Structures are given as C-alpha cells and as structure tokens.
Amino acid sequence: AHAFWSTQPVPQTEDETEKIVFAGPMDEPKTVADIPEEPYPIASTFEWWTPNMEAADDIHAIYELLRDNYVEDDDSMFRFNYSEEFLQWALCPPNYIPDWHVAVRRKADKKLLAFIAGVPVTLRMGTPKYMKVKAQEKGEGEEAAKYDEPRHICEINFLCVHKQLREKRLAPILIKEATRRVNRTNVWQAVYTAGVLLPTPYASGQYFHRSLNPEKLVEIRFSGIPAQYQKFQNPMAMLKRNYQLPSAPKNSGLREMKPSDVPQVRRILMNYLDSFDVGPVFSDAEISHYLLPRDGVVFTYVVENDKKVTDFFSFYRIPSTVIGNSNYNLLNAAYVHYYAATSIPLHQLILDLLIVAHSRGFDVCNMVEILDNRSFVEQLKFGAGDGHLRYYFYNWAYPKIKPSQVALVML
Ligand SMILES: CCCCCCCCCCCCCC(=O)SCCNC(=O)CCNC(=O)[C@H](O)C(C)(C)COP(=O)(O)OP(=O)(O)OC[C@H]1O[C@@H](n2cnc3c(N)ncnc32)[C@H](O)[C@@H]1OP(=O)(O)O
Ligand SMILES: CNCc1cccc(CN2CCOCC2)c1
C-alpha cells in the first residue's frame, strides 16, 4: 500500500505496466491556469526556500544536507558526498529554471531540512521499437507514433529529507510542490531514477564496478576476495596484479576534449544515442555543459584522427564518505558517463577510461548496464554489484524495456 503513490499518475503495478503498448500521458489534460499559484501548504514552523544554486553559500547549504543525509548503501558503510562544484554543474545546465530547485527550511533558524531538484531535459520517450512492430501488425501505427517528438520534460534528482525528519510524510509534500512548480511552467512529465522499488519502473539495471585500487576497496569492505584466491599463498598480491592497468592511455591521439570539439562530439553522440528507445537530445550548449572537462567533476577525452573526432568517452566523480572505517575518509569513484565509438571497439575505448581514472587517483569505476555498457563488462573486469538502478516516468505510460535500450545517464 502506497498512501501517496496510489494518488499519482504512474502505473500502479507491474501487471499494469505489462499491459502498456503505447507511450503517452496518464493524467487528465491540464493547463498552467488550472495549477495553484500558491505554494503547497506546510506546517507553520517550516518555510519553502528556493536556493540560488550559483550563490556559493546556498550550494554549500545543499552540499551539507546531502553529505550528512543523502543515499547510503544498504549496510550504511558509504554515503554519497557530491561536491559543491558537482552540485553547481548538475543543478545549473543551460536554460535551467531556478524555481525547480525546492527546499524546506526551519523558519526560526533557517536550518535546511529537505531538498528536491528538477532540471530541464529534452528526452525521446516515444513508443519503443518492439512495440512499434506490434502496432504495425495491428494497424495502430499512428497511435504508436503520436508522442515520438522529443519532449521538454523535468529530470528530478537529489530528493533528501534530513535524518531527524524521516517518516513524517515530508517527501510527498516536496514531490507535490516540485510537481506544482514544474506544471506552472507547462511541463507535465518527469524522469527520475532510484535504487528502491516504487510504482512502477519502465527499466531496471544492475550496477557494475571495476576495481582500480583493490587494496583500499577490500580494506573498506567495498570489495571481497573470491574464495578461489585462497588457493594462492598471497591472495592480495594476486588481486593487485589482476586489476593492474597501464600507466598511460593506449589509443594514439586520445586527448582531453576542448571547446572546438563540441559540434563533432554532439554529432557522434547524437548519432549513437538515437539507436536507443529512451534517450536525451542535446544542443551544442548542453554538450558543452555536460561534457567539457571540469576539475574534480567531469572528465572527457576524445580520439582525434586526421583532425576529426571519431570517438570519445566521459566520466564523472562522486566520492562517498566511508562511514565506519577510520583509516579512509572517502571512496573516490568514477562513473561512466556518455561515450561514442566509431573507429575502435568499445572495450578498447573504455580501457583508456579506466587507465585515465586510475592515473588520476580514482578507487573504482561504476556504471549501470544501460547504453552498451554490457559489451565491455567481461573484457575490462567489471563485476556485478549488489545495487540496481530503476528508471521511472511521472505522468507517462511506457512499455517495459531492457536497460540496454536506455541512453539517459543519471547523475
Ligand atoms: C511533472 C513534474 C513531476 C515532478 C515530480 C516527479 C516525481 C519525483 C519522485 C521523486 C524521485 C526522487 C529520485 C531520487 O532523488 S532517488 C534518491 C532518494 N533519496 C535518498 O534515498 C536519500 C536518503 N533518504 C531520504 O532522504 C528519505 O528517506 C526520502 C526523502 C527518500 C523519503 O523520505 P522519508 O523516508 O522521510 O519518508 P516520508 O514519510 O517523508 O515519505 C514516504 C513516502 O515517500 C516514498 N518514497 C520513499 N523513497 C522514495 C524515493 N526515492 N522516491 C520517491 N518516493 C519515495 C514512499 O514510498 C512513501 O510513499 P507511499 O509508499 O506512502 O505512497
Ligand atoms: C543515479 N543517482 C544516484 C542514486 C540515487 C539513489 C540510488 C542509487 C543506487 N543505490 C546507491 C546505494 O547502493 C544501492 C544502489 C543511486
């Protein structure tokens, strides 16, 4: 039973989702004028706050809330520690709407108690390929194609309630207020991801991890040692040897991305992403924002051949607080971001990603099995993790799809 989610325009069960054959909205059609102009009511001791996510001090406030209260693993060994610079990057893409960043503060002392963020994204979210085939068979192709045009929607992230305020039904109030503010800007769908199972995902993928600093990963109990290593006189020396990487990239003409690369990177990325059922559409400004290198935040390299960009990869940094081990403060993780290969096999491109991340002091490389991430798991010694990432839409019926049909990376 879901006292809140049962009231929302989402499919309610897996059985319902199994029956969906066309992409389209769930809710009654509404207009901006129908939506309350006033913020959703909240208790008198609380106030709504719209942070300025280009004021250093407001970013710092959000940073502290998330550092102390955001997502942990299931054993509460690690907690995400997104940096202030990362938050500015993630929250302020081109044409972001400041009003979509929603906070709750205690009115008396302005202590930040809760947060949710929305940013604009242009998303292809029309009926998936396998369902369009069925629609053709049945003479229903017009209906199946109705919502094929890329849609300007909201991407929700960073929902967080302070630990001291948990289980008090604040999350539904945050979600309702974010929904109101987005609806007041004539936007009616959202996309979001979560580790937890909610009604009702359109896709779900396992996490994968590639050890870069295995001695540290084992120390902090991120990683275990296969029982088979006990056949060796020295399990750990063998483990280090297993995960060893070259000191320098192998692809000649790999270099960091620069601003003049933007249009070529846009073209090769967009050509690649268009093959997936669900995926973002990026302008030059959005390619520049999401992919140009930013120290400590995002790292992007291109393969240039004959003065042409033919391949690229990107990764972003999210460290996590190591909660229970006093020997290390942080786990330094690199996450596979967008990429495109046209000249070399993907495993050869992504090896250089691992090389660069290792050289820069990263402990592990993480990803979900979206895109063609499965195509280099075995060659590059990624192992499946405990975690999954579930993909959701708000106010959008969508047939179930494999995670290898999803091309949207979520930070
Ligand atoms: C058109 C525009 C639309 C815009 C909005 C689109 C929708 C966006 C939706 C948000 C996408 C976020 C994407 C991310 O950021 S995923 C990351 C979520 N954040 C964390 O996990 C951080 C650590 N945890 C917390 O801060 C709290 O435990 C949270 C805030 C998660 C819940 O707070 P609390 O534990 O104090 O509980 P409550 O009593 O206040 O509320 C209980 C209700 O909340 C439902 N719940 C629990 N977890 C989630 C979850 N991750 N997404 C959606 N709903 C969730 C739960 O089923 C229950 O509803 P119901 O079962 O009774 O029905
Ligand atoms: C994509 N945005 C970050 C994210 C948010 C919520 C949940 C997750 C995935 N969890 C992490 C903890 O270990 C279990 C899996 C990731």
From TrEMBL:
Keyword Transferase applies: yes
Name of the protein described by the UniProt record: Glycylpeptide N-tetradecanoyltransferase
Pfam families xrefs: NMT, NMT_C
The species this protein was found in: Leishmania major
One GO molecular-function entry: metal ion binding
All copies of domain Glycylpeptide N-tetradecanoyltransferase C-terminal, residue ranges: 219-402
Residues annotated as binding Mg(2+): 165
Keyword Transferase annotated: yes
